């Protein structure tokens with residue numbers, strides 16, 4: 037649901053849990069939430085149609 | 092430095108009545124302790140903060156991790172050791188003109204104490220080895236970092252040699268003590 | 273530097289009538305104060321402006337903050353201290369040739385004054401500690417920045433040792449005073 | 454440098470008939486002027502061109518602006534001052550053998566002149582202060598630039614101290630001049 | 635360094651009864667070994683860690699590969715050699731002040747042993763040459779790297795010359811041994 041501004045990584049070759057930063061961590065959150073909402077609306081409409089039509 | 096002042100002071104301080112063991116002790120402290128520190132010493136620890144590098148971009152991690160790893164360089168410790176060990180024999184210059192054996196006893200016991208204390212402090216500060224890796228977790232460094240050391244094999248030898256000499260001198264001091272009552 | 277001139281001048285200045293306490297004071301000032309500064313001193317404060325770094329890109333923020341943090345290095349303060357404390361004993365070289373006890377009193381009181389003043393100035397300038405962080409708010413630097421220090425644990429020891437020696441010498445001077453009337 | 458040659462030469466030049474005031478003047482010039490320059494001096498002005506930086510990319514602005522700000526370092530001015538002030542007393546080595554009080558008068562006059570001239574030159578060259586900012590408008594720099602200085606508080610002290618010593622010596626010289634006629 | 639202390643100690647240690655071969659040995663150790671190390675030596679090995687570079691970006695490969703290639707610089711090995719070889723003759727002062735031939739035998743034996751041991755150690759540590767390439771496979775370096783050396787032709791000469799001198803001295807010591815029984 038969100039995108040933070042700090043990630044701690046411990047992968048090779050990185051030595052022992054270094055820190056890494058991020059770019060534009062606030063537009064991506066908005067875009068996430070927006071698309072989630074749209075997809076939910078589509079889900080609801082399809083469900084209502086199926087019910088109205090189905091047995 | 093200026094090691095000639097100490098030379099002249101000593102040359103004026105050794106005109107004192109002693110015994111075989113005191114002369115042996117003076118010989119040992121003069122050859123294996125001074126002539127090594129005066130000549131071979133200053134050039135090993137001259138590039139200790141310049142070739143010490145950590146793996147990070149944070150300004151202020153190298154200084155902190157150095158000060159945390161080597162709070163005091165060995166060479167200064169040994170210089171102080173030499174001076175404080177030779178003092179009780181320098182006080183004779185002051186005690187002489189006053190009159191113009193008891194003092195022997197006092198000197199001996201104080202030398203025992205100083206030597207033992209310095210050996211113990213040496214074991215508790217540095218140890219027996221100097222490795223080529225350190226892990227540092229002091230502000231501003233981020234949670235831990237690896238820091239690398241310079242010439243870590245040419246200092247271990249010094250450490251061991253000095254430990255041996257100190258042990259020998261402690262033994263000789265105790266021997267001179269038991270020869271007293 | 274050239275510390276032999278001082279050696280010869282002193283060796284010619286100590287041919288004076290003194291008492292136990294004056295000789296003890298001379299011994300202390302000679303061993304625990306000079307021989308340390310001459311030998312162990314110059315190499316600690318040699319990389320003080322080169323390893324001092326602040327967190328900024330502004331040109332001229334390191335020089336200002338340095339000058340604001342360490343306006344005067346410790347070693348030069350101590351050198352000046354030594355010279356000004358030894359002067360009254362040097363004036364004898366002149367008084368004697370002029371005459372070829374009162375002077376004793378004058379020397380004593382002046383030594384008292386100088387020692388006390390220098391100890392107080394030491395407490396008011398530097399303090400008891402040297403930390404590894406400084407906050408700077410002096411032009412050209414932007415309102416406030418952080419600046420880091422080098423070897424902040426090897427200078428605190430010097431500070432403390434010198435404070436102790438100065439205290440002891442003040443005590444001895446006052447003792448010699450009360451022995452006068 | 455080699456300050457022992459001067460020591461020996463002087464030690465062979467002071468075997469001359471003088472009075473209280475001449476000896477006081479010699480003492481002052483020897484303690485507060487020579488021992489300060491020999492020991493504390495050479496090390497302050499060692500990083501004067503390396504830590505002087507201007508705010509520009511033009512190659513050749515730092516050199517020009519330095520040469521325009523500090524045409525001559527203080528320490529060499531003071532060395533020259535010392536030598537030229539001690540000269541009239543060295544010429545006794547040459548007059549002695551040739552004779553194997555008039556000379557006294559000539560010495561005194563020339564000492565007066567040299568001391569006054571050097572004090573006035575000090576006033577007109579450097580001043581009473583050393584600031585941490587300079588404005589430079591010399592080719593190749595573009596019409597003006599700010600240039601920053603290193604250790605601007607450790608040199609003001611030297612300036613003031615030397616001004617005071619010079620004033621005292623001028624006073625003593627005039628006192629000796631008003632003692633003959 | 636301060637090589638005058640050794641000079642005075644020796645000048646006081648050679649007032650001993652010897653024979654042709656001891657004097658020849660002293661001459662050789664004094665000319666071809668001391669005067670070469672005091673003057674020409676300290677300046678060749680001053681840029682040994684600063685001009686040693688490996689082909690990699692990993693921080694901490696140069697220090698490790700250096701410490702693995704040159705664990706100890708030749709010059710300090712030779713200094714130690716000189717001191718330990720001259721000791722048995724320095725130990726005559728104490729015996730002299732004590733008595734105020736057997737000793738000759740003991741000195742000779744110990745000199746034989748020390749010389750042979752140091753020659754063999756030289757063979758086993760460094761060798762007969764110093765090349766301009768090294769292959770390093772020590773952490774943190776990745777599985778291998780080439781590392782390049784500075785002035786690799788000015789040190790081979792020193793090595794060879796010192797090997798020759800040591801051989802000659804061993805020969806002379808054995809010759810003096812067979813002269814007794």
Ligand SMILES: CCCCCCCCCCC(CCCCCCCCCC)(CO[C@@H]1O[C@H](CO)[C@@H](O[C@H]2O[C@H](CO)[C@@H](O)[C@H](O)[C@H]2O)[C@H](O)[C@H]1O)CO[C@@H]1O[C@H](CO)[C@@H](O[C@H]2O[C@H](CO)[C@@H](O)[C@H](O)[C@H]2O)[C@H](O)[C@H]1O
Nearest residue numbers: 098101102105106107108109114117118121639724727731
């Ligand atoms: C880095 C600087 C280190 C400083 C190194 C300075 C070197 C010291 C040299 C040795 C030294 C100090 C003590 C040595 C122990 C330490 C060994 C050092 C080992 C270092 C490698 C001996 O010191 C003696 O110790 C005696 C102790 O009993 C003492 O005797 C006292 O006990 C009584 C009982 O109470 C007491 O009442 C009373 O007051 C004393 O009778 C003597 O007074 C004292 O002179 C001083 O050297 C003395 O002077 C010369 C130069 O040496 C040397 O040669 C001279 O005589 C030769 C006649 O043939 C001949 O050559 C020449 O005429 C001449 O040249 C002397 O022979 C030597 O004696």
Ligand SMILES: CCCCCCCCCCC(CCCCCCCCCC)(CO[C@@H]1O[C@H](CO)[C@@H](O[C@H]2O[C@H](CO)[C@@H](O)[C@H](O)[C@H]2O)[C@H](O)[C@H]1O)CO[C@@H]1O[C@H](CO)[C@@H](O[C@H]2O[C@H](CO)[C@@H](O)[C@H](O)[C@H]2O)[C@H](O)[C@H]1O
Nearest residue numbers: 181184185188279282283286287288289290295298299302
């Ligand atoms: C880094 C720069 C520091 C330089 C350090 C220089 C070392 C100084 C050495 C001590 C020193 C200065 C004062 C010491 C106090 C400070 C202690 C320092 C401690 C430092 C660790 C003593 O000074 C004496 O002080 C006396 C004060 O009363 C004074 O006596 C006056 O009181 C009257 C009352 O009015 C007054 O009227 C009148 O004028 C005086 O009668 C003497 O004239 C004066 O010589 C000078 O040393 C003197 O010379 C030799 C070398 O020492 C030493 O050995 C010599 O004699 C030995 C006979 O066996 C024997 O060996 C040899 O024949 C010979 O070799 C002497 O024994 C020593 O005396």
Ligand SMILES: CCCCCCCCCCC(CCCCCCCCCC)(CO[C@@H]1O[C@H](CO)[C@@H](O[C@H]2O[C@H](CO)[C@@H](O)[C@H](O)[C@H]2O)[C@H](O)[C@H]1O)CO[C@@H]1O[C@H](CO)[C@@H](O[C@H]2O[C@H](CO)[C@@H](O)[C@H](O)[C@H]2O)[C@H](O)[C@H]1O
Nearest residue numbers: 362365366369460463464467468469470471476479480483
């Ligand atoms: C950085 C290098 C600086 C160099 C520093 C060198 C130190 C100088 C020491 C003082 C000094 C120079 C002048 C001092 C003024 C400047 C003060 C300096 C202040 C600095 C802190 C005095 O100089 C004297 O000046 C007199 C002026 O009148 C002159 O007298 C002339 O006037 C006549 C009238 O015409 C004229 O005809 C005629 O020719 C002279 O009769 C003398 O000949 C002359 O010797 C030379 O020192 C002399 O030698 C020894 C060592 O000092 C000192 O100790 C010795 O005697 C003691 C007997 O107890 C005793 O200890 C010992 O036996 C012995 O050891 C002497 O006592 C001292 O005298």
Ligand SMILES: CCCCCCCCCCC(CCCCCCCCCC)(CO[C@@H]1O[C@H](CO)[C@@H](O[C@H]2O[C@H](CO)[C@@H](O)[C@H](O)[C@H]2O)[C@H](O)[C@H]1O)CO[C@@H]1O[C@H](CO)[C@@H](O[C@H]2O[C@H](CO)[C@@H](O)[C@H](O)[C@H]2O)[C@H](O)[C@H]1O
Nearest residue numbers: 640641642644645648649650651652657660661664665668
């Ligand atoms: C980097 C530091 C190195 C230090 C270098 C110091 C230089 C040493 C100089 C040589 C040296 C040390 C030994 C030399 C061997 C090593 C060669 C070194 C080669 C280096 C390039 C000789 O040493 C002698 O050795 C003899 C051994 O037998 C010994 O004799 C013993 O045997 C007995 C049997 O038991 C025994 O009982 C008993 O005790 C002794 O009788 C002597 O006592 C001893 O003095 C000391 O020098 C001595 O003093 C002067 C200065 O030299 C020199 O000139 C003086 O005499 C000249 C009369 O014309 C004339 O000029 C002048 O009056 C005067 O000036 C002397 O002539 C010279 O003798």
